[PDB]
PDB file of C-alpha atoms in Angstrom:
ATOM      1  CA  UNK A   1       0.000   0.000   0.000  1.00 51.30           C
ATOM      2  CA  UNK A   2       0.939   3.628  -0.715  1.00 52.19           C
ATOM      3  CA  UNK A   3      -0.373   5.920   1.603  1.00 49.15           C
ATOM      4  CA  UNK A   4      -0.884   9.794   0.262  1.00 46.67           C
ATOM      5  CA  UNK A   5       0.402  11.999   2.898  1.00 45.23           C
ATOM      6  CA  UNK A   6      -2.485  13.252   4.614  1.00 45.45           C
ATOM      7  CA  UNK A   7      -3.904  10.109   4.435  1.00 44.18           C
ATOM      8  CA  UNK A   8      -1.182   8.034   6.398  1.00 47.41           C
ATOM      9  CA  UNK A   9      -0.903  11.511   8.873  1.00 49.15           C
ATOM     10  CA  UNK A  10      -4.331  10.888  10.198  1.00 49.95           C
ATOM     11  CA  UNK A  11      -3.704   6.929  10.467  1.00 49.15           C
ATOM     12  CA  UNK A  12      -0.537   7.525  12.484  1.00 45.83           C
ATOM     13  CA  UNK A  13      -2.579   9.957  14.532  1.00 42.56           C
ATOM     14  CA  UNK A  14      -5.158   7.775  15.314  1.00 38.69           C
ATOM     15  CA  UNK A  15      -2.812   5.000  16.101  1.00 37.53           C
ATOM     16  CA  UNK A  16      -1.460   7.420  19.269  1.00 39.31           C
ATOM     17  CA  UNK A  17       2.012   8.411  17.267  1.00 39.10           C
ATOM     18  CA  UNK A  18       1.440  12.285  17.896  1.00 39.18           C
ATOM     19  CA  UNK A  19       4.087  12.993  20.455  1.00 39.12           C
ATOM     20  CA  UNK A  20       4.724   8.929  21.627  1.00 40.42           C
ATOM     21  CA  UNK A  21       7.987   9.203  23.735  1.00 38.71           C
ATOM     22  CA  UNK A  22       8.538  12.913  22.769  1.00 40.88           C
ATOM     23  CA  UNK A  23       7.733  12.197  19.084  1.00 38.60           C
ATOM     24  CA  UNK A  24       5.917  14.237  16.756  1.00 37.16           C
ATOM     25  CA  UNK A  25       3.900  13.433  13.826  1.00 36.40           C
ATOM     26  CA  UNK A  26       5.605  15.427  11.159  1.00 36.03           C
ATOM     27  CA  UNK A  27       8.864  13.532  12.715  1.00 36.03           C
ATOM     28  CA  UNK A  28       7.003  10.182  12.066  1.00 34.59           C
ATOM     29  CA  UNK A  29       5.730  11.437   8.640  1.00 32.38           C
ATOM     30  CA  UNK A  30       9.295  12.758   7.618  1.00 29.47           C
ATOM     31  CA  UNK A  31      10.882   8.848   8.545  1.00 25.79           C
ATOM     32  CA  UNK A  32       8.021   7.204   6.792  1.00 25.06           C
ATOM     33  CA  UNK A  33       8.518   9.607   3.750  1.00 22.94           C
ATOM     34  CA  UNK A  34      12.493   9.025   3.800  1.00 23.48           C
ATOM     35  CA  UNK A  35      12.656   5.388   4.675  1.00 23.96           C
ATOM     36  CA  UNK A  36       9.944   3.752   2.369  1.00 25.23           C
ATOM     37  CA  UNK A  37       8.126   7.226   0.729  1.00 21.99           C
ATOM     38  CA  UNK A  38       4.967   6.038   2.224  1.00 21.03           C
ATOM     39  CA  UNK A  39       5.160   2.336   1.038  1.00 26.30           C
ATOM     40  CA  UNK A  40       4.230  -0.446   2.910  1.00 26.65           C
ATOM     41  CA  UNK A  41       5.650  -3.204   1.098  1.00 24.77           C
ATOM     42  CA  UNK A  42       8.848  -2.001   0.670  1.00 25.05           C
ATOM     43  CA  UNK A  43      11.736  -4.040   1.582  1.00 24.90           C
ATOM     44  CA  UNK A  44      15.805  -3.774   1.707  1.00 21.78           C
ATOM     45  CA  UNK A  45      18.238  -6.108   1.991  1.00 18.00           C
ATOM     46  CA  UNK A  46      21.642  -5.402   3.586  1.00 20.31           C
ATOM     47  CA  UNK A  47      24.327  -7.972   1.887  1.00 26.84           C
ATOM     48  CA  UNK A  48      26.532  -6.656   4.509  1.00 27.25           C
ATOM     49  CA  UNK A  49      25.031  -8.515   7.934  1.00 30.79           C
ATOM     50  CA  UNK A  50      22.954 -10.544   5.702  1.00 28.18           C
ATOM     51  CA  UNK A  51      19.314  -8.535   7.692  1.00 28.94           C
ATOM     52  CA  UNK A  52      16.810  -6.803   5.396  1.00 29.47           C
ATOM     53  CA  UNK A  53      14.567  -4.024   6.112  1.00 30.34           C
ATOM     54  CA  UNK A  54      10.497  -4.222   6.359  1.00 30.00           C
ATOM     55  CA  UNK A  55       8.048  -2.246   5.657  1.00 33.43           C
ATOM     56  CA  UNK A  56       6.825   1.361   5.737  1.00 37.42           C
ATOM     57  CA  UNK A  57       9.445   2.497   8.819  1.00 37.94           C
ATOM     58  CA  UNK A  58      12.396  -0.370   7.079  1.00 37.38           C
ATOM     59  CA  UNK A  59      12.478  -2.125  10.743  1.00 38.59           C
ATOM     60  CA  UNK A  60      15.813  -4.361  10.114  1.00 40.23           C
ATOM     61  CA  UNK A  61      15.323  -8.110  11.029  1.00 42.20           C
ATOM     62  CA  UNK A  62      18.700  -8.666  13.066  1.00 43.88           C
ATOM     63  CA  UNK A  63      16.920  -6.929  16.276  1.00 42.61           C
ATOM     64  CA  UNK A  64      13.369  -6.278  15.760  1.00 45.53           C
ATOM     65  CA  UNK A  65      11.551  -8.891  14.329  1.00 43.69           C
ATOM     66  CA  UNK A  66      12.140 -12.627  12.624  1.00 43.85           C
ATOM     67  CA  UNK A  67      12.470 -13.815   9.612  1.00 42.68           C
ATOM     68  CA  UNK A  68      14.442 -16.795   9.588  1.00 44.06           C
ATOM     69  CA  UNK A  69      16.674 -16.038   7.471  1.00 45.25           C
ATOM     70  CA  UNK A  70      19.494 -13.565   9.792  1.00 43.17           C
ATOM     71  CA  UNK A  71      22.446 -14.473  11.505  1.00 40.47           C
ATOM     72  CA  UNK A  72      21.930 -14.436  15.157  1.00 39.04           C
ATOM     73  CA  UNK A  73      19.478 -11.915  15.198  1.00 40.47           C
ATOM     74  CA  UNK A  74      16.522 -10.777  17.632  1.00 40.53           C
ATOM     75  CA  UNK A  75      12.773 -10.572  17.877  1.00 39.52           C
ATOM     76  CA  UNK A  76      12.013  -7.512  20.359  1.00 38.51           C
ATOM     77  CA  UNK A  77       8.705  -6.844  18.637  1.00 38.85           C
ATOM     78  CA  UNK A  78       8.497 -10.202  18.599  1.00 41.20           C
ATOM     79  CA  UNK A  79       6.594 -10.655  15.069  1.00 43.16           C
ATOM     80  CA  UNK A  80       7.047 -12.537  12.118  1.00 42.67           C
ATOM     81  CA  UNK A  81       8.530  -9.691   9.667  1.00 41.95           C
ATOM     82  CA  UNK A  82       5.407 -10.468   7.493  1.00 41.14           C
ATOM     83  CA  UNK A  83       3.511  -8.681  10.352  1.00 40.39           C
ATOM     84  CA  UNK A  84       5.700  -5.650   8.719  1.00 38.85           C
ATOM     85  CA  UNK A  85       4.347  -5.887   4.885  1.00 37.09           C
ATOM     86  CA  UNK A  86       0.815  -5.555   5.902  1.00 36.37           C
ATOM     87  CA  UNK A  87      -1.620  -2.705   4.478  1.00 33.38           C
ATOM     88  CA  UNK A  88      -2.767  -2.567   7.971  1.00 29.47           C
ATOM     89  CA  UNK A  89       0.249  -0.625  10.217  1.00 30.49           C
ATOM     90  CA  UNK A  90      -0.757  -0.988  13.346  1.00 28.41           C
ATOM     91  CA  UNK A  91       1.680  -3.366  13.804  1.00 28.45           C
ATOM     92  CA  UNK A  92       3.890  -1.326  12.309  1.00 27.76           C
ATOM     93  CA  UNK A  93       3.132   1.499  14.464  1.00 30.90           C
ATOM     94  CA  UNK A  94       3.355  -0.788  17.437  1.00 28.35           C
ATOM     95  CA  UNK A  95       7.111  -1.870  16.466  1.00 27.85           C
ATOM     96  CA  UNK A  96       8.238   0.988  16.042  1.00 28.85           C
ATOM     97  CA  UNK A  97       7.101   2.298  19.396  1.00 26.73           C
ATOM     98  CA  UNK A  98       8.947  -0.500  20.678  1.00 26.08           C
ATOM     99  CA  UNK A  99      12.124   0.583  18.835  1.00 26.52           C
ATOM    100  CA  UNK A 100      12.057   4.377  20.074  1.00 26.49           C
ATOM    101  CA  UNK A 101      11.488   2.754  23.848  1.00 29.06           C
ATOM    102  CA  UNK A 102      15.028   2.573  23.485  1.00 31.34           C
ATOM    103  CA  UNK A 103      18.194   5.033  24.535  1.00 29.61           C
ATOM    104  CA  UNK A 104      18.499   6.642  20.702  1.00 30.52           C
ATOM    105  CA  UNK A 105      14.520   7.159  20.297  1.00 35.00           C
ATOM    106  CA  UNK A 106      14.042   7.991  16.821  1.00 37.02           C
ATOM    107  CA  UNK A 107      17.596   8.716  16.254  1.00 40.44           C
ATOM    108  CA  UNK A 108      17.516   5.036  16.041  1.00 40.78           C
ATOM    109  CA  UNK A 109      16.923   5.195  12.284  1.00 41.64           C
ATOM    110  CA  UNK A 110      20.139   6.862  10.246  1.00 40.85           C
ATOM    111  CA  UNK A 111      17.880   8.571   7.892  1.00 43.57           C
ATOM    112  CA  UNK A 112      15.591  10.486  10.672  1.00 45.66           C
ATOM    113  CA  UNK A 113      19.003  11.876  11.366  1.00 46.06           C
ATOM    114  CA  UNK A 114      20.610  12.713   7.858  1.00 46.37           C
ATOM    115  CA  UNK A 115      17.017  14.037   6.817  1.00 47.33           C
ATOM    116  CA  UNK A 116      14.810  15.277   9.523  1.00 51.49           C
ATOM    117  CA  UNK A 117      16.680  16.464  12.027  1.00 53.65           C
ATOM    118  CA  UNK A 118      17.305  19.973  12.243  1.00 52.26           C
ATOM    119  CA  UNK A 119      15.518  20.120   8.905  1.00 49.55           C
ATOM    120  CA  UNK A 120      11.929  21.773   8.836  1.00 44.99           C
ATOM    121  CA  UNK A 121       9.614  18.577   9.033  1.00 43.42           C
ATOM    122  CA  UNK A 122       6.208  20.544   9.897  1.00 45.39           C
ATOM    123  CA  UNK A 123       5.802  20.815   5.824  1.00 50.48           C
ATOM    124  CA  UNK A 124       4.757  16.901   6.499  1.00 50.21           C
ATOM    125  CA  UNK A 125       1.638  17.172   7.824  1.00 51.21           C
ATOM    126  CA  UNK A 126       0.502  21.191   6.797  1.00 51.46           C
ATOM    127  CA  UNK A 127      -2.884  20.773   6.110  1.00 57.48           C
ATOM    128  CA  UNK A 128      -3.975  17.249   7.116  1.00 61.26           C
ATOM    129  CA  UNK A 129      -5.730  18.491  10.012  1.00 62.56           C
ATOM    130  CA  UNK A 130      -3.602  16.633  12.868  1.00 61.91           C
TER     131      UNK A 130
END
């Protein structure tokens, strides 16, 4: 599924994102729209450590969730990461609470940093109504 921008701001919303652990929205919006550009079904793998990346947030398989297929790797969403590729998020949404639960927060993700931080994000979500 691709979500149009307003339309995956007011999912997000609903799904308590706005402000989760110090999080806004348009910080959410501006990973989602740098890691995947608003696809859920989009999917990376890393030759390197042999993980891939899931989904609309690209959770990577050697901590978050299981797949099988990774070299001594975790499951601290504890999901399949088929839960991941879904056209329903909340899943999603509920992993990658779990992932900002942790000492980085969103800084977590490489591409929150190199994109969205200390970069205007609020254009994200101007005029969805959230």
């Amino acid at each position: 599924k691709v979500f149009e921008r307003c339309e995956l701001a007011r999912t997000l919303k609903r799904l308590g994102m706005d402000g989760y652990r110090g999080i806004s929205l348009a910080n959410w919006m501006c990973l989602a729209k740098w890691e995947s550009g608003y696809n859920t079904r989009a999917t990376n793998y890393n030759a390197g450590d042999r993980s891939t990346d899931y989904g609309i947030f690209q959770i990577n398989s050697r901590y978050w969730c299981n797949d099988g297929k990774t070299p001594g790797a975790s499951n601290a969403c504890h999901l399949s990461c088929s839960a991941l590729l879904q056209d329903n998020i909340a899943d999603a949404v509920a992993c990658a609470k779990r992932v900002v639960r942790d000492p980085q927060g969103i800084r977590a993700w490489v591409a929150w940093r190199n994109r969205c931080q200390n970069r205007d994000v609020r254009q994200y979500v101007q005029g969805c109504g959230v």
